Amino acid sequence: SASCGSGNFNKTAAKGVEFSAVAGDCIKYNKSSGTLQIGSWTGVASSYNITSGPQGITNTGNGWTTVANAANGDLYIKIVSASRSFNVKFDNW
C-alpha cells in the first residue's frame, strides 16, 4: 500500500507521448529496451522514485534526464515533488 506499483498506479505513460503530471502521480511505464529518459520543458523541477529502481531522479524542466539503471519491463514511477502540474514524457533509446 506504501509502494507505487501495479495495484495503485493512476496513469500509464506511452513511449515519447507527453502528458500532464502532478506530484503524487504513480505512473506505469513499460521499457522494452535501451535507457530510460524523462523529458520536460515546462520549467518546473520534478523528482521521481522508481519502485525497486533508481530513486531521487530529478528533472529541472528544460530537457531530458537519463536514468541509466532502470530495468526493462513494467516500471512504476512515483512523482515525488513538483510545484505545479507539468507536461512530461517518458521515453527510452
XYZ file of all heavy atoms in Angstrom:
675
model
N 0.824 -1.205 0.000
C 0.000 0.000 0.000
C 0.861 1.260 0.000
O 0.412 2.310 -0.453
C -0.948 0.013 1.203
O -0.230 0.212 2.407
N 2.101 1.154 0.489
C 3.021 2.285 0.532
C 3.935 2.361 -0.686
O 4.750 3.287 -0.776
C 3.874 2.227 1.802
N 3.828 1.422 -1.621
C 4.692 1.380 -2.790
C 3.868 1.636 -4.038
O 2.825 1.003 -4.242
C 5.413 0.032 -2.906
O 6.608 0.024 -2.148
N 4.335 2.572 -4.858
C 3.755 2.779 -6.175
C 3.970 1.522 -7.002
O 5.108 1.073 -7.176
C 4.400 4.015 -6.817
S 4.206 4.242 -8.601
N 2.882 0.920 -7.470
C 3.007 -0.349 -8.155
C 1.745 -0.729 -8.891
O 0.845 0.085 -9.087
N 1.689 -2.008 -9.282
C 0.648 -2.463 -10.201
C -0.752 -2.247 -9.648
O -1.700 -2.056 -10.419
C 0.860 -3.943 -10.527
O 0.622 -4.734 -9.374
N -0.908 -2.271 -8.325
C -2.218 -2.161 -7.718
C -2.722 -0.755 -7.472
O -3.879 -0.585 -7.084
N -1.898 0.270 -7.677
C -2.348 1.616 -7.347
C -1.842 2.693 -8.298
O -1.995 3.881 -7.986
C -1.944 1.980 -5.912
C -0.471 1.815 -5.668
O 0.351 2.074 -6.549
N -0.119 1.370 -4.470
N -1.245 2.337 -9.435
C -0.841 3.367 -10.378
C -2.086 4.005 -10.974
O -3.087 3.328 -11.228
C 0.071 2.796 -11.472
C -0.624 1.886 -12.461
C -1.026 2.364 -13.701
C -0.831 0.544 -12.167
C -1.649 1.531 -14.620
C -1.455 -0.295 -13.084
C -1.860 0.197 -14.309
N -2.037 5.327 -11.155
C -3.188 6.069 -11.648
C -3.017 6.610 -13.063
O -3.991 7.121 -13.627
C -3.536 7.232 -10.696
C -2.438 8.287 -10.614
O -1.298 7.991 -10.259
N -2.787 9.528 -10.938
N -1.824 6.510 -13.651
C -1.591 6.929 -15.027
C -0.676 5.930 -15.721
O 0.176 5.306 -15.088
C -0.964 8.333 -15.101
C -1.919 9.454 -14.727
C -1.233 10.812 -14.644
C -2.241 11.884 -14.244
N -1.620 13.219 -14.057
N -0.849 5.795 -17.034
C 0.040 4.986 -17.860
C 0.686 5.891 -18.901
O -0.013 6.624 -19.609
C -0.708 3.833 -18.550
O -1.341 3.014 -17.565
C 0.249 2.973 -19.362
N 2.013 5.850 -18.977
C 2.762 6.657 -19.927
C 3.102 5.829 -21.153
O 3.486 4.661 -21.039
C 4.050 7.197 -19.302
N 2.978 6.445 -22.326
C 3.347 5.814 -23.585
C 4.651 6.416 -24.093
O 4.919 7.606 -23.897
C 2.243 5.976 -24.637
N 5.465 5.582 -24.738
C 6.787 5.992 -25.191
C 6.717 7.270 -26.014
O 6.015 7.331 -27.027
C 7.405 4.865 -26.015
C 8.838 5.127 -26.442
C 9.305 4.057 -27.426
C 10.802 4.202 -27.686
N 11.103 5.472 -28.381
N 7.435 8.299 -25.562
C 7.542 9.550 -26.284
C 6.295 10.404 -26.330
O 6.283 11.407 -27.049
N 5.249 10.058 -25.587
C 3.971 10.755 -25.676
C 3.783 11.599 -24.420
O 3.643 11.063 -23.314
C 2.804 9.777 -25.863
C 1.494 10.545 -25.898
C 2.988 8.995 -27.156
N 3.756 12.912 -24.605
C 3.696 13.850 -23.495
C 2.354 13.752 -22.781
O 1.315 13.510 -23.401
C 3.906 15.271 -24.017
C 4.727 16.165 -23.134
C 5.169 17.431 -23.844
O 5.041 17.500 -25.082
O 5.652 18.355 -23.165
N 2.376 13.954 -21.463
C 1.136 14.016 -20.693
C 1.325 14.938 -19.500
O 2.446 15.197 -19.065
C 0.667 12.636 -20.209
C 1.616 11.968 -19.249
C 1.384 12.005 -17.885
C 2.724 11.282 -19.713
C 2.254 11.389 -17.010
C 3.595 10.663 -18.844
C 3.360 10.714 -17.492
N 0.203 15.422 -18.965
C 0.235 16.304 -17.810
C 0.372 15.477 -16.538
O -0.378 14.516 -16.320
C -1.024 17.169 -17.753
O -0.994 18.035 -16.628
N 1.321 15.864 -15.696
C 1.660 15.131 -14.493
C 1.582 16.073 -13.302
O 1.690 17.292 -13.453
C 3.057 14.522 -14.608
N 1.362 15.493 -12.114
C 1.353 16.238 -10.859
C 2.060 15.410 -9.793
O 2.153 14.182 -9.890
C -0.074 16.598 -10.381
C -0.733 17.580 -11.325
C -0.928 15.334 -10.204
N 2.583 16.101 -8.780
C 3.123 15.415 -7.615
C 2.101 14.423 -7.084
O 0.901 14.711 -7.031
C 3.494 16.423 -6.529
N 2.578 13.243 -6.697
C 1.715 12.199 -6.204
C 1.320 11.178 -7.252
O 0.913 10.060 -6.890
N 1.434 11.532 -8.532
C 1.128 10.583 -9.595
C 2.007 9.346 -9.473
O 3.186 9.432 -9.124
C 1.332 11.227 -10.965
C 0.154 12.063 -11.393
O -0.919 11.910 -10.784
O 0.304 12.863 -12.345
N 1.419 8.189 -9.762
C 2.137 6.920 -9.804
C 1.926 6.363 -11.205
O 0.805 5.983 -11.567
C 1.642 5.966 -8.717
S 2.202 4.250 -8.896
N 2.993 6.355 -11.996
C 2.932 6.166 -13.440
C 3.455 4.784 -13.781
O 4.553 4.414 -13.354
C 3.779 7.217 -14.177
C 3.534 8.625 -13.621
C 3.547 7.106 -15.689
C 2.265 9.215 -14.049
N 2.694 4.035 -14.572
C 3.186 2.804 -15.170
C 3.826 3.139 -16.508
O 3.231 3.854 -17.324
C 2.048 1.797 -15.361
C 2.477 0.423 -15.877
C 1.243 -0.348 -16.349
C 1.585 -1.650 -17.026
N 0.336 -2.317 -17.496
N 5.046 2.642 -16.717
C 5.755 2.779 -17.983
C 6.458 1.470 -18.293
O 7.151 0.915 -17.434
C 6.788 3.914 -17.949
C 7.460 4.127 -19.290
C 6.753 4.663 -20.351
C 8.792 3.795 -19.490
C 7.352 4.867 -21.588
C 9.409 3.997 -20.726
C 8.678 4.534 -21.768
O 9.259 4.745 -22.998
N 6.291 0.977 -19.512
C 6.961 -0.241 -19.935
C 8.143 0.133 -20.822
O 7.964 0.788 -21.851
C 6.007 -1.171 -20.678
C 6.672 -2.460 -21.071
O 7.344 -2.529 -22.098
N 6.494 -3.499 -20.253
N 9.339 -0.272 -20.423
C 10.542 -0.006 -21.201
C 10.968 -1.286 -21.894
O 11.309 -2.268 -21.230
C 11.674 0.517 -20.324
C 12.967 0.755 -21.108
C 13.903 1.714 -20.383
C 14.630 1.031 -19.242
N 15.601 0.001 -19.709
N 10.959 -1.278 -23.221
C 11.287 -2.505 -23.932
C 12.790 -2.707 -24.065
O 13.250 -3.853 -24.119
C 10.626 -2.504 -25.309
O 10.958 -1.323 -26.011
N 13.566 -1.627 -24.096
C 14.990 -1.718 -24.386
C 15.643 -0.380 -24.072
O 14.972 0.603 -23.741
C 15.229 -2.093 -25.848
O 14.650 -1.108 -26.688
N 16.968 -0.357 -24.177
C 17.673 0.906 -24.109
C 17.655 1.509 -22.717
O 17.555 0.816 -21.705
N 17.744 2.832 -22.674
C 17.903 3.576 -21.434
C 16.732 4.534 -21.253
O 16.392 5.283 -22.177
C 19.227 4.348 -21.439
O 20.316 3.422 -21.543
C 19.379 5.141 -20.143
N 16.136 4.519 -20.058
C 15.000 5.380 -19.748
C 15.404 6.849 -19.806
O 16.479 7.229 -19.345
C 14.457 5.047 -18.354
C 13.264 5.849 -17.819
C 12.010 5.604 -18.662
C 13.014 5.507 -16.345
N 14.519 7.678 -20.352
C 14.719 9.117 -20.436
C 13.441 9.792 -19.953
O 12.338 9.359 -20.304
C 15.022 9.557 -21.880
C 15.989 8.660 -22.677
C 17.462 8.803 -22.308
O 18.265 7.873 -22.513
N 17.829 9.954 -21.786
N 13.578 10.835 -19.137
C 12.435 11.589 -18.624
C 12.609 13.026 -19.077
O 13.610 13.673 -18.734
C 12.320 11.510 -17.092
C 12.080 10.071 -16.647
C 11.209 12.433 -16.596
C 12.226 9.863 -15.148
N 11.651 13.519 -19.848
C 11.768 14.813 -20.508
C 10.663 15.771 -20.120
O 9.490 15.394 -20.072
N 11.038 17.023 -19.861
C 10.039 18.037 -19.577
C 10.602 19.401 -19.935
O 11.810 19.635 -19.847
C 9.598 18.020 -18.111
O 8.595 19.008 -17.928
N 9.706 20.298 -20.347
C 10.096 21.615 -20.829
C 9.237 22.717 -20.227
O 9.314 23.868 -20.674
C 10.056 21.638 -22.364
C 11.042 20.650 -22.915
C 12.345 20.897 -23.269
C 10.836 19.241 -23.104
N 12.949 19.730 -23.684
C 12.047 18.701 -23.585
C 9.742 18.391 -22.924
C 12.192 17.350 -23.894
C 9.891 17.042 -23.222
C 11.108 16.539 -23.702
N 8.451 22.402 -19.199
C 7.569 23.371 -18.558
C 8.320 24.351 -17.660
O 7.764 25.392 -17.296
C 6.500 22.613 -17.758
O 5.827 21.694 -18.627
C 5.471 23.553 -17.170
N 9.574 24.074 -17.324
C 10.305 24.913 -16.397
C 10.085 24.582 -14.939
O 10.540 25.334 -14.075
N 9.393 23.490 -14.640
C 9.100 23.077 -13.272
C 10.034 21.935 -12.915
O 10.117 20.946 -13.652
C 7.631 22.645 -13.124
C 7.371 22.067 -11.744
C 6.717 23.819 -13.361
N 10.739 22.069 -11.792
C 11.564 20.978 -11.289
C 10.682 19.856 -10.760
O 9.676 20.099 -10.090
C 12.491 21.471 -10.182
N 11.066 18.617 -11.053
C 10.309 17.469 -10.578
C 11.284 16.385 -10.138
O 12.459 16.390 -10.510
C 9.360 16.945 -11.664
O 10.062 16.654 -12.855
N 10.793 15.455 -9.327
C 11.634 14.373 -8.849
C 10.825 13.087 -8.827
O 9.596 13.109 -8.668
C 12.226 14.662 -7.462
O 11.234 14.618 -6.452
N 11.537 11.968 -8.974
C 10.931 10.672 -9.245
C 11.626 9.593 -8.438
O 12.852 9.599 -8.316
C 11.034 10.313 -10.733
C 10.528 11.409 -11.646
C 11.313 12.532 -11.919
C 9.272 11.320 -12.241
C 10.861 13.529 -12.745
C 8.811 12.313 -13.079
C 9.614 13.416 -13.329
O 9.173 14.433 -14.146
N 10.832 8.665 -7.908
C 11.318 7.400 -7.363
C 10.719 6.263 -8.180
O 9.499 6.206 -8.362
C 10.937 7.219 -5.881
C 11.605 8.218 -4.973
O 12.611 8.817 -5.337
N 11.068 8.388 -3.767
N 11.566 5.355 -8.655
C 11.120 4.154 -9.345
C 11.079 3.021 -8.337
O 12.082 2.735 -7.670
C 12.041 3.798 -10.518
C 12.047 4.925 -11.570
C 11.608 2.463 -11.117
C 13.013 4.675 -12.722
N 9.920 2.381 -8.223
C 9.766 1.286 -7.270
C 10.720 0.155 -7.623
O 10.782 -0.282 -8.773
C 8.323 0.788 -7.269
O 7.454 1.869 -6.929
C 8.133 -0.344 -6.244
N 11.478 -0.303 -6.626
C 12.550 -1.282 -6.800
C 13.604 -0.830 -7.802
O 14.338 -1.665 -8.340
C 11.992 -2.648 -7.208
O 10.928 -3.037 -6.353
N 13.691 0.475 -8.055
C 14.606 1.013 -9.028
C 15.296 2.269 -8.531
O 15.276 2.592 -7.339
N 15.946 2.988 -9.445
C 16.629 4.231 -9.067
C 15.685 5.224 -8.416
O 14.523 5.353 -8.808
C 17.150 4.764 -10.404
C 17.338 3.538 -11.229
C 16.209 2.617 -10.847
N 16.193 5.936 -7.410
C 15.389 6.910 -6.684
C 16.123 8.242 -6.596
O 17.327 8.332 -6.842
C 15.024 6.381 -5.294
C 14.444 4.972 -5.380
C 13.246 4.766 -4.496
O 13.156 5.336 -3.409
N 12.309 3.942 -4.956
N 15.377 9.289 -6.260
C 15.955 10.621 -6.264
C 16.296 11.133 -7.644
O 17.239 11.918 -7.794
N 15.562 10.688 -8.662
C 15.740 11.190 -10.019
C 15.197 12.606 -10.080
O 14.094 12.868 -9.599
C 14.989 10.295 -11.014
C 15.447 8.838 -10.919
C 15.137 10.825 -12.445
C 14.453 7.880 -11.581
N 15.959 13.529 -10.666
C 15.493 14.900 -10.780
C 15.517 15.347 -12.234
O 16.379 14.938 -13.017
C 16.331 15.854 -9.929
O 17.719 15.735 -10.293
C 16.143 15.539 -8.439
N 14.545 16.189 -12.579
C 14.467 16.839 -13.881
C 14.172 18.306 -13.623
O 13.245 18.626 -12.876
C 13.378 16.200 -14.759
C 13.239 16.880 -16.109
O 12.676 17.966 -16.227
N 13.792 16.253 -17.132
N 14.970 19.201 -14.200
C 14.841 20.617 -13.882
C 13.895 21.357 -14.809
O 13.731 22.570 -14.651
C 16.206 21.308 -13.906
O 16.808 21.157 -15.197
C 17.118 20.723 -12.842
N 13.274 20.665 -15.759
C 12.214 21.251 -16.550
C 12.646 21.870 -17.855
O 11.894 22.670 -18.423
N 13.829 21.538 -18.351
C 14.279 22.067 -19.632
C 15.159 21.035 -20.340
O 16.236 21.345 -20.850
C 15.004 23.399 -19.447
C 15.271 24.099 -20.769
O 14.517 23.946 -21.736
N 16.349 24.866 -20.821
N 14.700 19.793 -20.400
C 15.377 18.791 -21.196
C 15.119 17.399 -20.651
O 14.116 17.155 -19.994
N 16.063 16.510 -20.941
C 15.932 15.084 -20.669
C 16.841 14.665 -19.522
O 18.037 14.968 -19.533
C 16.309 14.268 -21.901
C 15.396 14.408 -23.065
C 15.544 15.240 -24.137
C 14.189 13.677 -23.280
N 14.495 15.067 -25.013
C 13.651 14.108 -24.505
C 13.505 12.702 -22.543
C 12.457 13.588 -25.024
C 12.324 12.184 -23.055
C 11.818 12.626 -24.292
N 16.292 13.906 -18.579
C 17.076 13.260 -17.540
C 17.268 11.803 -17.928
O 16.286 11.086 -18.119
C 16.388 13.345 -16.178
O 16.254 14.721 -15.798
C 17.250 12.620 -15.128
N 18.518 11.373 -18.052
C 18.821 9.983 -18.370
C 18.826 9.163 -17.084
O 19.375 9.589 -16.067
C 20.173 9.891 -19.078
O 20.132 10.681 -20.281
C 20.492 8.437 -19.450
N 18.184 8.004 -17.118
C 18.067 7.148 -15.938
C 18.703 5.810 -16.295
O 18.036 4.865 -16.723
C 16.617 6.993 -15.470
C 16.576 6.194 -14.167
C 15.971 8.374 -15.260
N 20.012 5.706 -16.064
C 20.797 4.629 -16.658
C 20.429 3.250 -16.124
O 20.612 2.248 -16.829
C 22.286 4.881 -16.430
N 19.955 3.150 -14.886
C 19.840 1.832 -14.269
C 18.397 1.356 -14.140
O 18.115 0.466 -13.332
C 20.531 1.823 -12.906
C 22.048 1.799 -13.019
O 22.624 1.001 -13.767
N 22.703 2.680 -12.272
N 17.477 1.915 -14.923
C 16.091 1.465 -14.883
C 15.942 0.183 -15.696
O 16.454 0.084 -16.814
C 15.156 2.553 -15.409
N 15.238 -0.794 -15.136
C 15.132 -2.090 -15.785
C 14.143 -2.040 -16.945
O 13.282 -1.160 -17.033
C 14.700 -3.161 -14.786
N 14.296 -2.989 -17.861
C 13.272 -3.199 -18.868
C 12.032 -3.802 -18.213
O 12.085 -4.333 -17.103
C 13.796 -4.102 -19.982
C 14.952 -3.479 -20.740
O 15.012 -2.260 -20.917
N 15.885 -4.315 -21.186
N 10.907 -3.713 -18.905
C 9.659 -4.212 -18.365
C 8.805 -3.102 -17.780
O 9.015 -1.912 -18.029
N 7.809 -3.517 -17.001
C 6.893 -2.567 -16.364
C 7.593 -1.829 -15.236
O 8.018 -2.445 -14.253
C 5.667 -3.286 -15.818
C 4.664 -3.617 -16.893
O 4.828 -3.136 -18.045
O 3.729 -4.388 -16.586
N 7.693 -0.512 -15.363
C 8.268 0.339 -14.331
C 7.159 1.132 -13.668
O 6.244 1.610 -14.342
C 9.296 1.303 -14.919
C 10.514 0.664 -15.578
C 11.336 1.732 -16.309
C 11.350 -0.075 -14.532
N 7.253 1.292 -12.352
C 6.282 2.086 -11.617
C 7.004 3.279 -11.022
O 7.889 3.126 -10.176
C 5.565 1.236 -10.571
C 4.701 0.216 -11.261
C 5.166 -1.071 -11.501
C 3.438 0.553 -11.725
C 4.383 -1.999 -12.165
C 2.646 -0.368 -12.390
C 3.124 -1.643 -12.609
O 2.343 -2.560 -13.270
N 6.626 4.465 -11.483
C 7.401 5.671 -11.252
C 6.529 6.648 -10.487
O 5.467 7.054 -10.969
C 7.907 6.262 -12.575
C 8.644 5.148 -13.324
C 8.803 7.453 -12.299
C 9.087 5.460 -14.710
N 6.953 6.975 -9.274
C 6.233 7.896 -8.412
C 6.798 9.294 -8.595
O 8.009 9.497 -8.468
C 6.365 7.467 -6.949
C 5.713 8.420 -5.963
C 4.202 8.256 -5.963
C 3.573 8.966 -4.770
N 2.109 8.732 -4.712
N 5.930 10.258 -8.873
C 6.332 11.659 -8.929
C 6.292 12.208 -7.509
O 5.212 12.421 -6.945
C 5.436 12.466 -9.867
C 5.504 11.855 -11.270
C 5.896 13.924 -9.882
C 4.789 12.672 -12.287
N 7.472 12.435 -6.934
C 7.574 12.758 -5.521
C 7.426 14.251 -5.265
O 6.950 14.647 -4.196
C 8.905 12.219 -4.960
C 9.068 12.589 -3.509
C 8.958 10.709 -5.097
N 7.809 15.100 -6.216
C 7.666 16.529 -5.986
C 7.529 17.251 -7.316
O 8.131 16.865 -8.322
C 8.851 17.096 -5.206
O 10.045 16.924 -5.946
N 6.725 18.308 -7.291
C 6.511 19.207 -8.413
C 5.641 20.351 -7.907
O 4.575 20.100 -7.331
C 5.847 18.482 -9.589
N 6.085 21.600 -8.082
C 5.338 22.716 -7.503
C 3.989 22.930 -8.182
O 3.099 23.534 -7.575
C 6.169 24.006 -7.556
O 6.422 24.400 -8.890
N 3.811 22.429 -9.402
C 2.573 22.598 -10.152
C 2.561 21.563 -11.267
O 3.590 20.969 -11.587
C 2.440 24.017 -10.719
C 3.564 24.437 -11.670
C 3.271 25.796 -12.299
N 4.364 26.261 -13.148
C 4.425 26.057 -14.459
N 3.446 25.402 -15.076
N 5.462 26.507 -15.154
N 1.385 21.360 -11.859
C 1.265 20.391 -12.939
C 2.226 20.745 -14.070
O 2.548 21.914 -14.300
C -0.169 20.340 -13.462
O -0.480 21.505 -14.206
N 2.691 19.722 -14.778
C 3.698 19.934 -15.803
C 3.601 18.831 -16.847
O 3.198 17.703 -16.549
C 5.106 19.977 -15.187
C 5.533 18.677 -14.548
C 6.454 17.855 -15.177
C 5.019 18.280 -13.318
C 6.852 16.653 -14.601
C 5.411 17.077 -12.738
C 6.330 16.263 -13.388
N 3.969 19.174 -18.078
C 3.977 18.208 -19.169
C 5.282 17.427 -19.166
O 6.373 18.010 -19.150
C 3.793 18.911 -20.517
C 2.380 19.380 -20.741
O 1.426 18.747 -20.292
N 2.231 20.504 -21.447
N 5.177 16.106 -19.207
C 6.356 15.257 -19.143
C 6.210 14.155 -20.175
O 5.097 13.745 -20.524
C 6.549 14.674 -17.726
C 5.386 13.732 -17.359
C 7.900 13.977 -17.606
N 7.335 13.663 -20.675
C 7.266 12.399 -21.384
C 8.340 11.441 -20.909
O 9.444 11.833 -20.532
C 7.335 12.554 -22.900
C 8.336 13.484 -23.472
C 7.900 13.733 -24.915
C 8.986 14.345 -25.775
N 8.525 14.531 -27.199
N 7.970 10.169 -20.920
C 8.883 9.074 -20.660
C 9.238 8.444 -21.996
O 8.353 8.232 -22.832
C 8.235 8.058 -19.721
C 8.062 8.571 -18.313
C 7.218 9.636 -18.037
C 8.777 8.016 -17.270
C 7.072 10.119 -16.739
C 8.635 8.508 -15.976
C 7.776 9.549 -15.718
N 10.526 8.182 -22.214
C 10.986 7.615 -23.476
C 12.132 6.663 -23.161
O 12.538 6.510 -22.008
C 11.393 8.728 -24.457
C 11.255 8.316 -25.928
O 11.456 7.127 -26.253
O 10.955 9.205 -26.767
N 12.638 5.987 -24.182
C 13.796 5.132 -23.983
C 14.495 4.970 -25.317
O 13.835 4.829 -26.347
C 13.411 3.763 -23.401
C 12.320 3.057 -24.200
O 11.134 3.343 -24.039
N 12.719 2.097 -25.029
N 15.823 5.006 -25.289
C 16.609 4.810 -26.504
C 18.047 4.464 -26.147
O 18.419 4.443 -24.970
C 16.570 6.053 -27.406
C 17.101 7.320 -26.779
C 18.400 7.603 -26.483
C 16.344 8.487 -26.419
N 18.500 8.859 -25.935
C 17.252 9.425 -25.891
C 14.987 8.827 -26.492
C 16.849 10.677 -25.431
C 14.585 10.069 -26.030
C 15.514 10.982 -25.506
